[PDB]
Amino acid sequence: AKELRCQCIKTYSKPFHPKFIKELRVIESGPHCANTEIIVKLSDGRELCLDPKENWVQRVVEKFLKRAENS
């Protein structure tokens, strides 16, 4: 219990697309973060962190849910 950083070290403002997303990850404020962070597995073969503060993020992410649900 000394110093803990949020899971999303940073976010990236580039408007991404749902075509590349296969796995979604959402972590609510934890003992390391006092807020909320959206995380996503990139098809490239790594992880990526989105900022719910951007409208395009709520969209590409919304489509993923509507796509994984309709599937």
């Binding site: 070290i9 976010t11 580039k14 990139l42 490239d44 790594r46 992880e47 962190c49």
Partner: peptide
């Protein structure tokens, strides 16, 4: 050869 009408990272310091 399907086109990717976009894009993904052009930097890398995002590994939770």
């Amino acid at each position: 050869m399907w086109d990717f009408d976009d894009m993904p990272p052009a930097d890398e310091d995002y590994s939770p």
